[PDB]
Scaffold this active site. Structure first.
Site, mmCIF file in Angstrom:
data_model
loop_
_atom_site.group_PDB
_atom_site.id
_atom_site.type_symbol
_atom_site.label_atom_id
_atom_site.label_comp_id
_atom_site.label_asym_id
_atom_site.label_seq_id
_atom_site.Cartn_x
_atom_site.Cartn_y
_atom_site.Cartn_z
ATOM 1 N N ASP E 57 0.827 -1.198 0.000
ATOM 2 C CA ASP E 57 0.000 0.000 0.000
ATOM 3 C C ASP E 57 0.863 1.251 0.000
ATOM 4 O O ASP E 57 1.616 1.499 0.947
ATOM 5 C CB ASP E 57 -0.949 0.023 1.189
ATOM 6 N N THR E 90 -5.213 4.411 -3.017
ATOM 7 C CA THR E 90 -4.110 5.344 -2.893
ATOM 8 C C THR E 90 -3.059 4.991 -3.918
ATOM 9 O O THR E 90 -2.520 5.854 -4.621
ATOM 10 C CB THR E 90 -3.529 5.240 -1.491
ATOM 11 N N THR E 91 -2.776 3.695 -4.005
ATOM 12 C CA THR E 91 -2.128 3.124 -5.167
ATOM 13 C C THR E 91 -2.589 3.815 -6.439
ATOM 14 O O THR E 91 -1.849 4.602 -7.037
ATOM 15 C CB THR E 91 -2.469 1.640 -5.211
ATOM 16 N N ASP E 391 -6.791 -2.430 5.882
ATOM 17 C CA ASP E 391 -7.303 -2.071 4.572
ATOM 18 C C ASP E 391 -8.555 -2.868 4.251
ATOM 19 O O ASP E 391 -9.593 -2.302 3.888
ATOM 20 C CB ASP E 391 -6.237 -2.319 3.516
#
Lengths: 521, 524, 98, 185, 525, 105, 74
Positions: E57, E90-91, E391
């Protein structure tokens, strides 16, 4: 070796030019930053952070210099910002340019004092000019204010969000009016709290009918949702607090030690029942909270918060109208936390927040800013700060000015009308300052990027006709535009201190003749 | 010249690794260092090794994990495999040696297929499925699932190997006492906690003179007399032996004269009453690590009592169980039911070391203690180290069941079986498992290296003799005969679980170290 | 600017094998020579003074060895043996080394 | 230094009680006079703050010593280092009060400063400065500071001298002739 | 220019800093793009302190990849916000960012003034979100629905097997979490990790586990039936808040002073024991106590002679989970002591591991707080999976939060693209350019997906760039064959707000990013 | 990799060095695009010896603008031929070059 | 902070000027210096001037060029 041992000194025209040059720099570094077509700047704080902001003040407030008048210029920016908020988009750019031509008579070997003398004359007409060309406005009408606000805010990146802020700015502003001064009620922008939370979107940020707390219930058993609670502001702590007189105990008998420990239990519980006797619901204090009492207050199912910041306690007090207490025994029911339309504590995502809504006619409010990233948020509120600030200034004066440079040319010829009728050596300075004024719309041209010279001459030519004074420069078309349809409208007082500040800058730097360093004290 | 360009100045001084190059080369090379670092390690023919730490402290050792704990490594994946085995020893004990070997060979073979161009992920899958299959076929090789809980002879024969593994010299002694150790402890706090065994190092009087006591010891002083009683009355107090000092300040204050006379006299007087009340219960020995009042011990000496001193929290905790008596934070109540009770306790002098002896006979089950005698403490530290690992072995033996054949033999079946499954995979992964099967050759290969004889033909001979199901025959230990030996009669067995887990962990080690491609390293 | 990753810390020395092994054997031989003269009815004794300046004579090598602050590791083992034997039986600790 | 020693725990509550009640009763005693504005250069406790809010009172802490002296001379107040009486009990009198038309704190340059309008006891004058930067104000007051003195001297001495350097213009010559009087060197 | 003002200052310029910033993100996106997509590779970090990562992440990477370029740090912040908002993507978010700016650059490199393109973006997102709003699939809280989504999310980080094992625990937690209206994810979610026996055996426990054990050997390790004492008041000694100097005159009093001092706590523990004995008159029942503060050994002994389980020094949030576990009434005052104030458990034992002690809560009839006990082979991996776990949960909380759901794997982006490419210059024309690239930037997700999957990009995009018919489908890119796929049919999904916020987040990021000219640095020494 | 061979050595990589050159040339072209064209502006160069230019033919400029990036110097050589071949449009060549690679990138 | 970026490291240390800023500002000011340097120069009322060269040689002057010749301007 005589004077001060390696402290530098300078005098006269070189000093004069040097101050002339630095301001020219000082104004220049920002000339990109005014106008609906402005640019937007991001800064390195010395310690690593980032601030991105168009408002010049912070930019200059974030500027380190060595030459003095720049720093002298610095404060002038922050002062007007402090008093007015914006115009900082423009005032200094006015200022240096005034100086920029102001030098032009230095080679004319004219003593600056007269040049000052004309200036004080010049501003007088200028203030008189604007008062003649001002327009009072109703303050009850929301939409024009909203128009005024967008007119006031269609310069910053929140431009895309004008509708939200305009009402947002209006609502908080309206709800802050402290009438115990008779009809001399005064609003405060420190009770106008601003809370920035990342995540969410601009659309999610909203005005809250009350206060928001970045804290949590001390105990789970206290409910996190209440309609019409009663709130206590205990300025004092909730626990046993020092016997202030370096007190001492000498027990001799066995039961004494155990006795005293109950007594502190007893002392604390004492506090609890005094609280409950007013049948409260919510407990707030800037200090700590005994869990043991909190057991009692849990036992009473009465909501409790510990160690809350004082200014918020005031705004919380100003939210629910109650008054803070440091004396549970002298607590008074006139400060019952009544005026509470809804009590809640939400989860923002990794943070509990305290939700205090629907006070009857609250005077305090915080604005909840929910965006992308705090530097984005911090930028927003600065624009919000200006937005709300001008509104109270509008709430301070109903008389309005049409900006867009329209007013600027109006005085410009007006002084030209004054100039030709004011024969003498001082005449040439007088027109020169008028010559100085013309740059702001001109500057607007560059930020748009249009044929500045032609448009300006025409605008002056346009404003040669007395019949029309609202003719100004559109932000985006870069075309001559009467303001009445355009609607970029401004508080007169905003422009007053603008010129007021501008000219003050001029005289102050002009009397200078000398530099002295190395004070060593 | 002299002027390359950078498209990413992102780094303030740091190591950005990428392009699989370090992965394809540098990561692999680092692991290959570890293999050579301890290649000599495992083997009854494998030899010990010493190191001094960054604080320059000697560590002679045969275990990999300890030296690995003694190695401040810096490469990323190296530690991973280190820490993998680190827990593995924390899981099983010995195996550190082997898993490290497992680590490299799988690593050592993997790059070649990676150099052959197989998918990095595919390497994982084939390695993975093979491991799962390898576990699957594993139990089918268990032999002689020895059952006797509490015999000496069976367990010693079993335990011999691990001692033999990390100490070739003196197995006969070490087993019987350690077998004596395991039998002397029963499930008392539950199934022979390893911590139930205590180790005491005394230099001098070489190892053959080392033995094990059915009780516990302290190399500690004594303050009064020295006696051991057939019926020992042991007094245990975390409480220090002084007038119970109220933690809050009561200083005596007087207002007339006679309090001076009275106070200290009574101050004496009740202390006598305190200690008498203890003696009334017949307590002949009192224990604590805490402070002792001089008159109090003066009184105990008046009452022919034994005393114990300055012991740590663990020391009382050990002893508390030994006679099963409760330590008393309250000084007064010499409880009969919670009173210490020992076979015999006295002080011994061994190797010029004042030594307090708790010589006990405990039918209900005791945490006995082992005496270490011999010259170099460096020997003691490892010589305890191996026995300790054997201790785990018994406990890990004591865990479930199922002795399995040691001496590489089991690994040979594994390879062949895994090889056999390899061609029945068919697919581009087939080579990886084919390599996965192959890597198990390293153990006897390394064993041959530590034997220092020509490996490959022995491997082939072992292969050949393993083509007839000879799962009990394995690598010999002999310069004369560099061919083979039958482990079953040799008793060279091992744990199912230890082999089982070490297989998995090394597997896990790989996929992880195999998994990553590009790395970042900040300046320390 | 890539760099290969080192295995252990810089200067973490290693030397392996016969030449490694023999070095100690010489080192042990070095040790005894400091004690070679020692035991014997016509044997010998030594004086060693600390860096502090407090001199110390000794005929018992174990004492001498304890004075002889060794930096070689394998030799310290020899030094340890002396303590054991000294903690056991005494002189001939002299011999014990030899 | 007065130590508080307890051998009988039963009154510590009463002890701790009165610890503030003294301040409280002093609050009550002064309030009972009905006074609506107070200053104290000393510190002011929140307990007092709470009480005055209940009074809706007006109070100041940490006021500079000289100004309140001007205040007492202005308002006709008596600055009080404490509460007292020619008799031992600390009493308070309305006659000690100072008086003025209206008092406001007002935020000038967004900062609320307190205004006093028309003390009837003694007429007062104070001046509020407005300017661009802090650099301008602190200098102009000095001129203002000097501005007072010269007029004060003119008030001090009911006599004037024409400005613009006439002095030496007259002096130079009159001495120039006067020099000839001595005849010395 | 202002260099005149300050020599040591540093300034950039409009053209200059603009290129610098876009160059900055272009590099930044390049590193991270390897990750998102199940085929992606997590990354391992080494501290200067020597610590170790195995993460994927990006926010973790960005937060820990020491960089100085400011825009990245700015981008890092919102990414962290997004992590505080949803956790993954976010990746994608940054990959969205720089790639947009890259496409943005292409036009200004043609001299186009950025202000125009921003407005194009402004219009572009609006239409997109308009499409985004309508296209989300309203789905119930079907266990499988979320299950696939959990598997959809969790595969982003770990083995297919590992997440599949993980998938069951989280969803059932989610099922066992809601009071049908409002989750907070903090109390009912206990994430505890042990370096124990596997990675896979990490499991939900229907009860609770504690990070410490009893401090006495006689303490019962295991109890069949647990009656629970939740508390925080210290049963360690304490001396009162007032200076209270005592003396005595007799050593007899000294002992009398010994007993008196203890007496207060003596009563305290006495109140409980009577209650216990009032409660646990039966021999079979076992009594357990939990304190947030510490406990006196003498008190420990007091319980010991009564064979009472008690625990001290708990983190302030654990009792909530305890109350959410056993229905126990967490209290402070033991004088107001009632058996109804108690908590009850169906089973408790303690688990000893390594040197530490771990304690086990089992068999709530209707547990409302549960625990993700993380079994670990390796410390980093525990940390590694935990991020994947947290996550995964935050995916679900929004997933339940939103009664709608977005099919994942970038099928939306093509849907975004075609609809947005299906926009005439109803715009003022010049904005259609920025819209075009805005739409153009959107296709990166499958592009990198194919890129991370190794399939050739340009052809696959064209392939999937086939809305089929009137049912021009929400078509995904196969993650293993690079082929058109119904994410809905295959059950590849995503949170709508995720898709919602990221567009909003990136857009605002973009416009301001394009709207700077020079980067100032004139600070004090 | 070859850092193993030499520590003081320096090497790039495929994506890396590629990215370098395009930026180098694109960086190169940006400077010169101000030049060509009658409406263009000639540029003044200052020697470290104090000498002076007022030219617009970038060949002089490139030849006299000290750069260390090799591809730029590589560009300098071929342009040096071109001016030795024709003299103008040397400007075009380099602007042609970089924008070519720009699209290529 | 402490780390801006450069889009063109083309220079090994040199002064590149751009944006007309020098032309609009720096070029002008330097010229303005020269005017200020010799504004007094000409005139029957214009007075002479002296300067020392780098080699410490005296030069009383009213002619601009000669004194201009004495200035290593940069």
């Amino acid at each position: 070796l005589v004077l001060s041992q390696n402290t530098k000194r300078e005098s006269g025209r070189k000093v004069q030019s040097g101050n002339i040059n630095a301001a020219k720099t000082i104004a220049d570094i920002i000339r990109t930053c005014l106008g609906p077509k402005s640019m937007m700047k991001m800064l390195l704080d010395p310690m690593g952070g980032i601030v991105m902001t168009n408002d010049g003040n912070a930019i200059l407030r974030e500027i380190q210099v060595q030459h003095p008048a720049a720093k002298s210029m610095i404060e002038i920016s922050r002062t007007q910002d402090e008093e007015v908020g914006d115009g900082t988009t423009s005032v200094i750019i006015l200022a240096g340019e005034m100086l920029s031509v102001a030098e032009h008579f230095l080679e004319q070997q004219m003593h600056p004092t007269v040049v000052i003398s004309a200036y004080r004359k010049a501003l007088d007409d200028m203030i008189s000019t604007l008062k003649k060309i001002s327009i009072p406005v109703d303050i009850s009408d929301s939409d024009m204010m909203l128009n005024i606000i967008n007119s006031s805010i269609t310069t910053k990146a929140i431009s895309r969000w004008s509708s939200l802020a305009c009402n947002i700015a209006l609502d908080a502003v309206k709800m802050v009016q402290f009438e115990e001064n008779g009809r001399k009620e005064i609003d405060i922008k420190k009770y106008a709290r601003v809370e920035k939370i990342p995540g969410g979107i601009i659309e999610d940020s909203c005005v809250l009918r009350g206060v928001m707390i970045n804290k949590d219930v001390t105990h789970p058993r206290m409910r996190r949702y209440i309609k019409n609670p009663r709130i206590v502001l205990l300025d004092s702590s909730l626990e046993y607090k020092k016997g202030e007189s370096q007190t001492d105990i000498e027990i001799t008998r066995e039961e004494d030690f155990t006795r005293i420990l109950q007594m502190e239990e007893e002392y604390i519980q004492q506090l609890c029942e005094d609280i409950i006797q007013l049948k409260p619901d919510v407990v707030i204090t800037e200090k700590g909270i005994s869990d043991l009492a909190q057991h009692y207050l849990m036992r009473a199912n009465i909501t409790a918060i510990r160690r809350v910041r004082k200014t918020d306690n005031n705004r919380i007090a100003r939210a629910c109208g109650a008054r803070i207490v440091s004396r549970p025994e002298e607590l008074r029911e006139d400060d019952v936390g009544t005026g509470a339309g809804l009590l809640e504590i939400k989860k923002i995502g990794d943070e509990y927040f305290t939700f205090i809504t629907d006070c009857k006619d609250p005077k305090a409010c915080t604005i909840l800013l929910r965006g992308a990233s705090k530097e984005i948020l911090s930028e927003v509120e600065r624009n919000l700060q200006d937005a709300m600030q001008v509104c109270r200034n509008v709430l301070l004066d109903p008389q309005l000015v049409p900006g867009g440079g329209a007013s600027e040319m109006a005085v410009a010829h007006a002084l030209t009308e004054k100039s030709k009728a004011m024969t003498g050596v001082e005449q040439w300075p007088y027109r020169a300052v008028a010559q100085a004024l013309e740059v702001i719309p001109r500057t607007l041209i560059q930020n748009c990027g249009a044929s500045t010279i032609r448009l300006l001459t025409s605008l002056r030519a346009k404003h040669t006709q007395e019949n029309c004074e609202t003719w100004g420069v559109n932000g985006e078309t870069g075309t001559l535009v009467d303001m009445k349809e355009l609607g970029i409208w401004e508080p007169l007082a905003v422009k007053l201190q603008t010129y007021k500040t501008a000219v003050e800058t001029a005289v102050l730097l002009l009397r200078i003749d000398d530099i002295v360093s190395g004070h060593k004290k | 010249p002299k002027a390359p360009g950078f498209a990413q100045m992102l780094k303030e001084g740091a190591k950005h690794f990428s392009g699989l190059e370090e992965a394809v080369y540098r990561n692999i090379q680092a692991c290959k260092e570890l293999a050579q670092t301890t290649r000599t390690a495992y083997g009854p023919n494998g030899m010990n090794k010493m190191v001094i730490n960054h604080l320059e402290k000697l560590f002679v050792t045969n275990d990999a994990a300890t030296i690995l704990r003694e190695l401040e490594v810096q490469h990323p994946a190296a530690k991973m495999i280190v820490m993998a085995s680190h827990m593995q020893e924390q899981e099983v004990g010995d195996g550190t040696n082997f898993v490290l070997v497992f680590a490299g060979a799988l690593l050592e073979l993997a790059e070649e297929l990676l150099r052959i161009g197989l998918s990095v992920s595919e390497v994982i899958e084939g390695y993975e499925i093979a491991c799962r299959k390898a576990h699957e076929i594993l139990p089918n090789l268990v032999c002689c699932s020895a059952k006797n809980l509490r015999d000496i002879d069976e367990v010693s024969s079993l335990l011999r190997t691990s001692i033999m593994s990390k100490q070739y010299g003196n197995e006969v002694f070490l087993a019987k006492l350690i077998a004596q150790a395991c039998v002397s402890i029963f499930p008392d706090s539950g199934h022979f906690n390893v911590d139930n065994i205590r180790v005491c190092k005394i230099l001098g009087s070489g190892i053959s003179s080392s033995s094990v006591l059915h009780g516990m010891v302290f190399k500690k002083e004594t303050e009064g007399d020295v006696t051991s009683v057939k019926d020992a009355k042991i007094a245990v107090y975390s409480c220090p032996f002084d007038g119970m000092i109220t933690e809050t300040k009561g200083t005596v204050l007087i207002k007339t004269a006679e309090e001076l006379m009275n106070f200290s006299k009574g101050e004496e007087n009740l202390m006598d009453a305190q200690v008498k009340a203890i003696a009334d219960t017949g307590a002949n020995v009192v224990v604590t690590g805490g402070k002792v009042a001089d008159m109090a011990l003066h009184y105990a000496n008046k009452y022919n009592i034994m005393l114990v001193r300055l012991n740590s929290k663990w020391d009382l905790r050990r002893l508390c169980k030994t006679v099963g008596a409760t330590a008393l934070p309250r000084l007064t109540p010499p409880v009969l039911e919670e009173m210490g009770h020992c076979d015999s306790v006295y002080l011994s002098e061994v190797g010029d070391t004042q030594v307090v002896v708790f010589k006990h006979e405990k039918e209900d089950g005791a945490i006995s203690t082992i005496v270490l005698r011999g010259s170099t403490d460096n020997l003691m530290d490892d010589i305890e180290r191996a026995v300790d690992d054997g201790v785990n072995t018994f406990k890990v033996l004591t865990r479930d069941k199922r002795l399995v054949p040691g001496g590489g033999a089991t690994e040979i079946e594994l390879a062949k079986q895994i090889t056999s499954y390899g061609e029945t995979c068919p697919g581009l992964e087939q080579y990886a498992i084919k390599k996965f099967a192959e890597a198990f050759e390293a153990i006897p290969r390394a064993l041959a290296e530590n034997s220092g004889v020509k490996a490959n033909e022995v491997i082939s001979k072992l292969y050949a003799v393993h083509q007839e199901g000879n799962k009990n025959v394995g690598l010999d230990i002999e310069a004369e005969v560099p061919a083979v030996k039958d482990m079953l009669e040799a008793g060279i067995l091992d744990t199912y679980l230890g082999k089982y887990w070490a297989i998995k962990l090394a597997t896990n080690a790989a996929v992880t170290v195999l998994r990553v491609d590009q790395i970042i390293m900040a300046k320390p | 600017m890539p760099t290969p990753v080192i295995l252990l810390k810089e200067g973490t020395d290693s030397s392996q094998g016969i030449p490694q092994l023999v070095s100690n054997i010489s080192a042990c031989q070095v040790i005894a020579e400091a004690v070679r003269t020692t035991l014997g009815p016509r044997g010998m004794d030594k004086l060693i003074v600390d860096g502090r300046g407090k001199a110390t004579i000794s005929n018992d090598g174990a004492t001498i060895l304890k004075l002889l602050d060794v930096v070689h590791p394998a030799a310290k083992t020899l030094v340890d043996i002396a303590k054991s034997q000294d903690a056991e039986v005494g002189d001939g600790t002299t011999s014990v080394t030899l | 230094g007065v130590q508080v020693v307890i051998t009988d725990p039963e009154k510590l509550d009463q002890i701790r009680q009165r610890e503030s009640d003294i301040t409280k009763e002093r609050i009550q005693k002064i309030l009972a006079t009905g006074a609506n504005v107070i200053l104290t250069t000393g510190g002011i406790d929140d307990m007092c703050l709470k009480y005055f809010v209940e009074a809706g009172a007006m109070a100041v802490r940490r006021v500079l010593k000289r100004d309140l002296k001007r205040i007492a001379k202005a308002s006709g107040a008596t600055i009080l280092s404490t509460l007292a009486n020619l008799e031992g009990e600390e009493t308070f009198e309305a006659a000690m009060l100072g008086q003025a038309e209206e008092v406001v704190q007002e935020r000038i340059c967004d900062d609320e400063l307190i205004l006093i309008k028309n003390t009837k006891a003694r007429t007062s004058a104070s001046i509020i400065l407005r300017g661009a930067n802090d650099f301008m104000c602190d200098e102009m007051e000095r001129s203002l500071h000097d501005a007072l003195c010269v007029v004060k001297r003119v008030l001090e001495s009911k006599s004037v001298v024409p400005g613009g350097g006439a002095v030496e213009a007259a002096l130079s010559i009159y001495l120039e002739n006067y020099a000839t009087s001595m005849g010395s060197r | 220019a202002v260099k005149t003002l300050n020599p040591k200052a540093e300034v950039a310029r409009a053209q200059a800093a603009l290129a610098v910033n876009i160059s900055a993100a272009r590099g930044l996106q390049d590193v991270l793009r390897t990750n998102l997509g199940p085929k992606g590779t997590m990354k391992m970090l080494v501290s200067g302190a020597g610590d170790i990562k195995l993460t994927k992440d990006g926010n973790v990477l960005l937060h820990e990849m020491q960089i100085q370029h400011p825009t990245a740090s700015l981008i890092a912040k919102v990414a962290t916000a997004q992590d505080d908002i949803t956790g993954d993507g976010t990746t994608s978010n940054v990959l969205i960012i720089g790639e947009l700016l890259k496409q943005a650059d292409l036009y200004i490199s043609e001299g186009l003034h950025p202000r125009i393109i921003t407005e194009g973006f402004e219009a572009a997102k609006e239409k997109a979100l308009q499409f985004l709003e309508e296209v989300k699939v309203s789905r119930e809280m079907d266990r499988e629905t979320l299950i696939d989504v959990a598997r959809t999310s969790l595969r982003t980080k770990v083995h297919a097997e590992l997440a599949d094992v993980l998938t069951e625990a989280v969803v059932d937690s989610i099922l066992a979490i809601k009071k049908q209206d409002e989750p907070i994810d903090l109390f009912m979610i206990e994430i505890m990790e042990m370096k124990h026996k596997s990675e896979t055996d990490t499991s939900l426990i229907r009860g609770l586990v504690l990070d410490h054990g009893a401090r006495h050997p006689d303490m019962k390790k295991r109890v069949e039936d647990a009656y629970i004492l939740t508390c925080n008041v210290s049963l360690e000694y304490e001396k009162t808040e007032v200076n209270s100097g005592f003396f005595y005159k007799s050593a007899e009093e000294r002992e009398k002073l010994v007993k008196a001092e203890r007496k207060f706590i003596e009563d305290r523990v006495k109140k409980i024991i009577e209650l216990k004995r009032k409660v646990c008159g039966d021999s079979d029942k076992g009594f357990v106590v939990i304190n947030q503060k510490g406990i006196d050994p003498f008190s420990l002994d007091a319980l010991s002679k009564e064979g009472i389980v008690a625990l001290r020094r708990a983190k302030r949030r654990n009792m909530e989970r305890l109350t959410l576990a056993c229905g126990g009434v967490a209290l402070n005052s033991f004088d107001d002591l009632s058996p109804d104030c108690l908590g009850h458990a169906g089973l408790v034992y303690e688990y000893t591991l390594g040197e530490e002690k771990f304690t086990f809560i089992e068999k709530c009839n209707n547990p409302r707080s549960v625990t993700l006990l993380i079994k670990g082979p390796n410390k980093h991996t525990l940390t590694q999976i935990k991020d994947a776990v947290r996550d995964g949960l935050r995916a679900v909380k929004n997933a339940i939060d939103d009664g709608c759901v977005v099919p994942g794997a970038g099928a939306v982006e093509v849907a975004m693209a075609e609809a947005l490419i299906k926009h005439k210059p109803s715009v003022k024309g010049r904005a259609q350019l920025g819209v075009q690239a805005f739409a153009d930037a959107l296709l990166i997700i499958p592009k990198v997906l194919a890129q991370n999957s190794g399939f050739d990009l340009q052809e696959t995009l064209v392939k999937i760039q086939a809305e089929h018919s009137e049912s021009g489908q929400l078509v995904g890119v196969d993650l293993n064959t690079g082929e058109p796929m119904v994410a809905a049919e295959v059950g590849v999904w995503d949170n709508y707000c995720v898709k919602k916020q990221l567009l909003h987040s990136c857009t605002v990021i973009a416009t301001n990013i394009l709207l700077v000219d020079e980067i100032m640095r004139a600070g004090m020494s």
